[PDB]
């Protein structure tokens, strides 16, 4: 259910999706701004490297949530979290609707429905700092 962990996940993702779409800095509206900056830099790198492939995927018009849930079917790791967020942020801007939170909610549910204790054991977003 929507407990402390849920909102730690959701509000990080939603503020990143807002920054990606508005190009306004959002690090000051999350609790863990150091991990936010890592997420932002990592997402930027993934998009810069893979945007053409993202375009081809997106052209199929398949529901983004069907894709996200398949990415996390077997295992989770920080690379998969980063890549899901980057892909969904990229998709959200080629198409404002992201303020409704649906994308961020879907990613959060996909992570926490199966990997809640993994995420807590990572000290929430702190675990992403292996990429700093």
């Amino acid at each position: 259910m929507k407990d402390e962990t849920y909102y730690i996940a959701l509000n990080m993702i939603q503020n990143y999706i807002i920054e990606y779409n508005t190009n306004k800095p959002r690090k000051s509206f999350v609790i863990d701004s150091i991990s936010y900056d890592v997420l932002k830099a990592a997402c930027k790198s993934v998009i810069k490297t893979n945007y053409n492939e993202f375009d081809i995927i997106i052209s199929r018009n398949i529901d983004f949530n069907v894709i996200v849930t398949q990415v996390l079917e077997d295992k989770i790791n920080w690379g998969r979290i980063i890549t899901i967020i980057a892909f969904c942020a990229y998709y959200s801007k080629k198409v404002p609707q992201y303020y409704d939170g649906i994308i961020s909610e879907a990613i959060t549910d996909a992570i926490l429905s199966k990997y809640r204790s993994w995420f807590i054991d990572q000290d929430y977003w702190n675990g992403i700092r292996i990429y700093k």
């Binding site: 398949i62 398949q70 990415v71 790791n77 690379g79 998969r80 980063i82 890549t83």
Partner: peptide
Amino acid sequence: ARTEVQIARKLQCIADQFHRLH
């Protein structure tokens, strides 16, 4: 089904190689 699995594999490739480099 398959196409959404094929897409997921593409993103998992990106993710898992990203994880490997960094």
